Amino acid sequence: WTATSGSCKGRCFELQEVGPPDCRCDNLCKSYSSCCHDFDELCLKTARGWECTKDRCGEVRNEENACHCSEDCLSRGDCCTNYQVVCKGESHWVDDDCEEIKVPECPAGFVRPPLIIFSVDGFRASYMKKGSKVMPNIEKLRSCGTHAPYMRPVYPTKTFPNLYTLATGLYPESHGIVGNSMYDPVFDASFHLRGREKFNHRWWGGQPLWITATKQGVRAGTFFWSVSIPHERRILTILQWLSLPDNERPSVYAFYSEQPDFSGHKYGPFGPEMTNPLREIDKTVGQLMDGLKQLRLHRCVNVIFVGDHGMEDVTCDRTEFLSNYLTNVDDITLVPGTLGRIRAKSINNSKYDPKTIIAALTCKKPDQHFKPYMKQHLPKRLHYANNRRIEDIHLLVDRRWHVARKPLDVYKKCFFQGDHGFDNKVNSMQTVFVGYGPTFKYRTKVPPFENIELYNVMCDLLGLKPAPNNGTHGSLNHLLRTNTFRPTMPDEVSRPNYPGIMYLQSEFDLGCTCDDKVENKLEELNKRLHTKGSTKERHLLYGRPAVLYRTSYDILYHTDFESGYSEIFLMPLWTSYTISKQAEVSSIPEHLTNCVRPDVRVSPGFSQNCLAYKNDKQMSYGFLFPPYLSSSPEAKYDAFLVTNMVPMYPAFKRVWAYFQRVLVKKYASERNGVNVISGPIFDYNYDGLRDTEDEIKQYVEGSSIPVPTHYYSIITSCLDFTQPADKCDGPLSVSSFILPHRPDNDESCNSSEDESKWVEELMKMHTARVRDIEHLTGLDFYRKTSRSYSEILTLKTYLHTYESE
Ligand SMILES: *[C@@H]1O[C@H](CO)[C@@H](O[C@@H]2O[C@H](CO)[C@@H](O[C@@H]3O[C@H](CO[C@H]4O[C@H](CO)[C@@H](O)[C@H](O[C@H]5O[C@H](CO)[C@@H](O)[C@H](O)[C@@H]5O[C@H]5O[C@H](CO)[C@@H](O)[C@H](O)[C@@H]5O)[C@@H]4O)[C@@H](O)[C@H](O[C@H]4O[C@H](CO)[C@@H](O)[C@H](O)[C@@H]4O[C@H]4O[C@H](CO)[C@@H](O)[C@H](O)[C@@H]4O)[C@@H]3O)[C@H](O)[C@H]2NC(C)=O)[C@H](O)[C@H]1NC(C)=O
Ligand SMILES: C[C@]12CN(C(=O)OCc3ccc(OC(F)(F)F)cc3)C[C@@H]1CN(C(=O)c1ccc(S(N)(=O)=O)cc1)C2
Ligand SMILES: [Ca+2]
Ligand SMILES: [Cl-]
Ligand SMILES: [K+]
Ligand code: NA
Ligand SMILES: [Zn+2]
Numbered sequence: 001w002t003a004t005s006g007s008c009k010g011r012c013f014e015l016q017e018v019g020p021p022d023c024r025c026d027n028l029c030k031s032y033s034s035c036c037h038d039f040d041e042l043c044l045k046t047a048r049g050w051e052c053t054k055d056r057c058g059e060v061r062n063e064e065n066a067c068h069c070s071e072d073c074l075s076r077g078d079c080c081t082n083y084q085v086v087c088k089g090e091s092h093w094v095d096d097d098c099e100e101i102k103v104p105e106c107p108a109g110f111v112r113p114p115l116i117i118f119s120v121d122g123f124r125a126s127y128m129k130k131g132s133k134v135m136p137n138i139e140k141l142r143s144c145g146t147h148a149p150y151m152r153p154v155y156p157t158k159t160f161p162n163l164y165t166l167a168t169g170l171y172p173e174s175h176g177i178v179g180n181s182m183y184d185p186v187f188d189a190s191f192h193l194r195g196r197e198k199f200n201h202r203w204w205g206g207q208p209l210w211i212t213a214t215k216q217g218v219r220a221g222t223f224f225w226s227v228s229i230p231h232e233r234r235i236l237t238i239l240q241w242l243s244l245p246d247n248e249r250p251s252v253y254a255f256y257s258e259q260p261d262f263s264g265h266k267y268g269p270f271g272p273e274m275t276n277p278l279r280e281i282d283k284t285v286g287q288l289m290d291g292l293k294q295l296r297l298h299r300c301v302n303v304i305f306v307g308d309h310g311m312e313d314v315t316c317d318r319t320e321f322l323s324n325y326l327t328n329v330d331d332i333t334l335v336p337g338t339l340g341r342i343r344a345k346s347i348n349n350s351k352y353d354p355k356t357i358i359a360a361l362t363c364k365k366p367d368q369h370f371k372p373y374m375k376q377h378l379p380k381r382l383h384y385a386n387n388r389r390i391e392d393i394h395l396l397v398d399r400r401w402h403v404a405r406k407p408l409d410v411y412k413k414c415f416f417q418g419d420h421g422f423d424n425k426v427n428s429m430q431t432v433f434v435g436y437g438p439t440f441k442y443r444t445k446v447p448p449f450e451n452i453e454l455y456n457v458m459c460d461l462l463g464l465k466p467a468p469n470n471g472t473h474g475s476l477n478h479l480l481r482t483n484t485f486r487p488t489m490p491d492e493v494s495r496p497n498y499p500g501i502m503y504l505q506s507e508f509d510l511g512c513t514c515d516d517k518v519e520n521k522l523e524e525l526n527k528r529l530h531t532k533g534s535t536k537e538r539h540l541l542y543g544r545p546a547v548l549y550r551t552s553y554d555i556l557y558h559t560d561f562e563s564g565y566s567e568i569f570l571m572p573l574w575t576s577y578t579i580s581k582q583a584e585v586s587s588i589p590e591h592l593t594n595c596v597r598p599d600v601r602v603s604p605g606f607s608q609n610c611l612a613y614k615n616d617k618q619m620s621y622g623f624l625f626p627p628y629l630s631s632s633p634e635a636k637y638d639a640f641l642v643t644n645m646v647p648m649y650p651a652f653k654r655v656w657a658y659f660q661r662v663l664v665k666k667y668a669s670e671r672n673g674v675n676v677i678s679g680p681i682f683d684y685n686y687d688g689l690r691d692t693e694d695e696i697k698q699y700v701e702g703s704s705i706p707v708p709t710h711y712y713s714i715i716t717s718c719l720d721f722t723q724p725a726d727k728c729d730g731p732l733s734v735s736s737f738i739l740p741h742r743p744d745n746d747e748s749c750n751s752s753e754d755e756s757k758w759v760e761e762l763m764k765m766h767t768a769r770v771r772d773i774e775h776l777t778g779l780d781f782y783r784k785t786s787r788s789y790s791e792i793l794t795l796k797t798y799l800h801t802y803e804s805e
Contacts, residue, residue, distance in 0.1 A: 002034040012043035013237045015222060015250065027237065030226035032199075050232040050287075052080045057087035067236055074294065077243025081235065081291040093289035093298060094137045098144035102481075104438040106300035109246040112218075113438050114297070115461050116238065117254045117304045118288065119166070120281060121159055122261025122420065124269055124310030125150030125430040127278060134275055135282040137289060138434070141305055144443060145436030146479050152450040152799070153309045155382045156339050156421045157429040159261070160193075162308035162451065167208035167223075169455030169469025171383040171688075173390065176205040181335055182389045183343070207467035209458055213252050216464050221253035231257060231284050239291040252462055255288070257281055261420075264311035268417035269428065302437030302461050306454070309420045312399050312428040314338070316414035319402040320369050325360050329405060332357065338421030340370060340395030340403040354393055361395070363749040369398040371747070376686040379766050380710065380738045380776070381799065382424070383470075385686040399426045425767075427803045441481050449476060449797065460485055472771055475793040489789065490780050492546035496555040496564060499601040501531075508604045511611030512596035516637055523634075531601075533557040538726055540576045541675045542716070543784025547573070549690070556601060556643060559635040561625035563644065567606040568693060570705050571646050574679040574779060575624035578726050579668040585661065588627050592640060599643040607642050612703035618743060619700050619707065622648040624678050626660035646680055647700050647707050649743040655762060656711065656739075658755035663763075664715075671717035671733070673725030680708035681738060681776045690778040712738045712773045714781065731787065735800035738768040738776065770796040 001021045008025035017026050020034065025043060029035035048056070048065045056069035066080075069087060073079035084090035104113045128147075132139050154165045154172055158180045161172040172178045182191040184203075191198050210220040221241055225234050238253050259277040267273040285305070292298040322340075323329045331352055335341040344352040354374070361372040373394045375385040384390060397403050399422050404410050422429055430448070435441075439461055456473040459466040460483045466473065477484040540562045547553065552567045561577035596610050613621050623644045630636035638644070648656060668674045682691040684698075698707040714736045718728030739762070745751035750758040770781055774796065782792045 002032075004035065004037050006036050008036045008039050008042045012039075013222075013240070015219075015241075015248075017222075027222050027225050027229060027234075030228055031224075044229070044233065050080060052083050052086040054086065066232070077240050077295070078236070079294060081239070081287040081294070084294050085290065090293070092286065093293045094140050094286055098140065098443075100442040101299050101438045104300050105296075107296055110300065111246070112251055112463060113461070114242065114250070114301050115252045115304070115458060116288070116301055117166075117252075117306065117458070118257075118285065119163065119254065120257045120260065120305070120307050120432070122259075122264045122309065122311045122418075123281075123307035123432050124260075124264075124428060125307075125432050126310075127260070128432055130270070131275070131278040134279045135285075137282050137285040138305065141285065141289075141303065141436045142434045145303075145434055146440040146442075146444045146446060147435075148433045148446050148448050150430035150448050151306065151433040152448060153307075153424050153429060153431055154451060155384055155424040157309040157424050157426075158338075158421045159308050163256075164204065164206075164208070166306065166308065166451055166454055167210075168206035169452055169466060169471040170206045171452065171470050173383055173385060173387040173688075174206060174470065176203055176387060176389065178384070178387050178389045179335065179339070179341070183333075184389050186388060206469070209252065209455060212459060212464050212467055213462060218252065218462050218464060219248075219250040221250040223254040223256075225256055227258065231255075231280075232287065235284060235287050235291060238288070239295065242292075242295060242297060252458075255284075257284065261311065264418040265416050266418070268313045269311040271417060300438065302435065302439050304454075304458070305432065305434040305436070306451075307431030307433075310427075310429045310431050311418045311420050312338075312422060312426070313417060314400055314402060314419035315417055316402075316410055318369070318400055319404050319410055320397075321404055321407055322361075323406040325364055326357065327360075328357075332405070334403070334405045335391070336404045336409065337402055338397050338419050340372075340393075340397060341391040342393035342395070343391040357393060362746055368749070369401040370395040370403050373747075376683075376709075377740055377742070377747070380683075380688065380772055381766075381768050383688055383772075386688065396423060397421075399423070399428060425799075425801045425803060435479055439481055439483050440479060444479075446476075446479055447794070447798075449794075450799075453797065456485070472793050472797050474790045475797045477790040478794065484790070487789065487793075489783060490546065490548050492780075493549055494547040494551050494553065496544070496547075496553055499554050499556075501600045503598070503600045503603060505598055505600065508598040508607065510596070510598065510604065510607060510609035510642060511614065512598065512609065512642060514595035514597045514637075514640060515591040516595065516597060516640075527634075530559040531557055533562070535559055536562055539578050539675075541578060541726060542782045544576075545574050545677070545779040545781050546783055547778065548780055549778040554602065556599070558625070558638040558641075560629070560631050560638060561644075563624065565602065565643050567602075569680070569682075570606065570608050572624055572643070572679055573777060574677050575644065576675065576677045577625050577629070578673065578675045579629055579664055580673045580724060580726065581668055583629060583631075583665065583668060585628050585665050586630065586636075589633075589636075592627075592636070595640040596642050596645060597637065597640050599641045602643055608645055608700075608705050609642075609703065612700045612705060613647070616701035618649065619647050620650050620653055621645050622653055622656050626664065628661045629664060646711075647705055649741065651744050652711075652739075652741055654745065654751075654755055655759055658759045659713070659739075659763065662756070663760065667715055667717075668725075671715075671725065672721045672723065673717060675716045675725050676713055677716075677781065678711065678713040679777065679779075680741075681710035681712055681773070682706060683709045683776055688772070688775050690776055708741050710738045710741050710776070712736065712768070712776070714770055714773060729786075731791065732782075732785070732795055734770060734795055734798055736768045736770055736773060737763050737766045738772060739763060739766050764802040767800050767802060769799050 003021040006023040011025040023036035024034040052069040061070040453471040456471040563572040563575040627639035696706040717725040719731040719733040
């Protein structure tokens, strides 16, 4: 109930919300059915439109007008945005040359440059180039300020998950808004685009920027605008707020546009109808900048122009139907569209089985345009699993397609030509970032980055301490002229041991054998030096990784590789090796096929054993440093040490062997040498974070050898590929992956073919940031380079995407 009989007199777009049944005058009262009776009349004036004309100049203040052209309007803070242009012979902001803003130029009483976030729904990254002729204001912001060629949204690339990720710095799995539509089984409640449940605070986790600001004494404009408030009015309201007295004036503001998304859905991302929405957004940017200029704020405010996601061509006819795969289609609930999420229609039905639903959906049709996953098997880069609102069964839908339950769902609901929501690596899903103002750099292009990073930067812009989030604070320092955040490297928590030779061969009873009993003073000081770290500068190029948790581990040196060997997990946490352009690939000699050798530096009690692998009929083993890349027949024996062994399903060994035999050398050839760090990952609770030992769900049968959920590799080289990886004077180039360690290759539909037809495709799908690996392992990489730490942070957030131009 609202007693809608109070009044908005002098309260129009009030900043503090009043509590029902008292009537509201804030920019959200409409959405709650709570506005006072006179809200439209007082607060939503439209008379005479949005612009001054020659004949309105110096008019007598008529309070009924939408905006004003009277002499007193500047001091009132309510002129039309083109007032000075029409009536005072001023130029529009867009017509002025750009001039570097070296320092904030702010009216007296401003304690900090205000921040204005101008968010545009569905603004695909290529609109910047393709619509440039019709967006002169946006283009000026872009070329004069700091811009990225695109910004990566989060998955799913829908509006709510992305705007709330912008506001919090969190992955959807952590902030809780995991789609535009959700069921939370704990609440037994559903979240929908339409309706009232979405307003309940229990959906919205983390701490969004407006709450972070308020808690730390920085006042915020109210971020959300009711759909019926026209754009012109939103701008005028922001401009009016900026005229409040110092003690009342917010420092941070948000504008949101439903365009171009609204039209993109109807006409497709490049429909001829899309030009007008782009012109109209540009005109709105023009109104804001002209309005700031009138208030002498155009060289004081930092403006961020940011999108939530792009838009792809998608039509009704490109829909896959679950009714073409499943017999039991009525026993499931599907969240449909550009992603799929499946659960049982009824929790009382004990005949529901996810294993058989997944199998019925797996590689069933030659050109199948979706792929089913258990959520924990989704690419780790999507960070889309650790939330009870995310159903166990997920369908990743190919770009340009939909998934629906039954045909009736599509024609009893072609309307649309655009949609979005797909995998956040998809080119058409990328969106925009421009920063313009005193605190951003001048005429600077920065590489693409992810929208989870922006919260930290928005906090830096406002002098706020960010709540804990998934950005990597300092990774976007290169966007900023000042207010940079200068982090220190995390402290190493565990120091390694450096074991020498301590065990005799006969102390080991591991059930392992090797054909290695064949017998030199010249070459015997040589082997000793190698085991003491003589070649370590070659193979460990960026320092050893730091272990950021409490554990017991040994550094092990070898001719061709160095490893940090965990006495707790019985295998390396990391193995580091460098492969030059010139390196040669050899085979595993016949006599050494099943060779595993005790490591006399490491106790039998802290070693794996071959008997466990023999007994475990499902599980085989692989090696972290690849025997194929040994530098000499003699060095090859090191690759067969029990301390280089890791557990691997036979199906996974197909993947791993092709990576090690073919791909590593291919990259070294293409990149002029590579440094590789590989290792296991254990993430049994799929939270993106390193497991402790007591979280491990699977061991090699009859042993304490834990089975990894994933294997990573970090592959580093010189960005200037004229220099070899091991003699690089400047910036680095990296690509990484986190491959799922699975007992089958059901994910790859072409896996009965030769590994040259499917393995690299699988690896590309599981591309990762070094930072993703850092979370999953508790390791910190690149500790010793000649590069600045912020540069290294940017490198650690880099994702190699494998999309074309
Ligand atoms: C991305 O960045 C984010 C933010 O930094 C990272 O997420 C953090 O990770 C931490 C480790 O997982 C986690 O710390 C835990 O906090 C628990 C208290 O949680 C509440 O308080 C915070 C602070 O305000 C709040 O943010 C939380 O909000 C969550 O939950 C509500 C709903 O309940 C949601 O509205 C909200 O969206 C958010 O949900 C997300 O996180 C939760 C986990 O908290 C997930 O379950 C959800 O799926 C969702 O993803 C909370 O309101 C605290 O209780 C934990 O302490 C336990 O573990 C420690 C280990 O140190 C142990 O010693 C303690 O005893 C305790 O164990 C006890 O409880 C266990 C479980 O019941 C039980 O098994 C034991 O026996 C014990 O009884 C823990 O410290 C932190 O909460 C989140 N923060 C956020 C916002 O998500 C994230 O990791 C980053 N991602 C990556 C890949 O890097
Ligand atoms: C919620 C809302 C955005 N809103 C609003 O005023 O937002 C202000 C804001 C600005 C910046 C923020 O973050 C920051 F500053 F950090 F960048 C956060 C919020 C009103 C719109 C209603 N909405 C929809 O109806 C809607 C629209 C489209 C889709 S779809 N089909 O997925 O495209 C789905 C739903 C979206
Ligand atoms: Ca984990
Ligand atoms: Cl959704
Ligand atoms: K076996
Ligand atoms: Na297969
Ligand atoms: Zn949309």
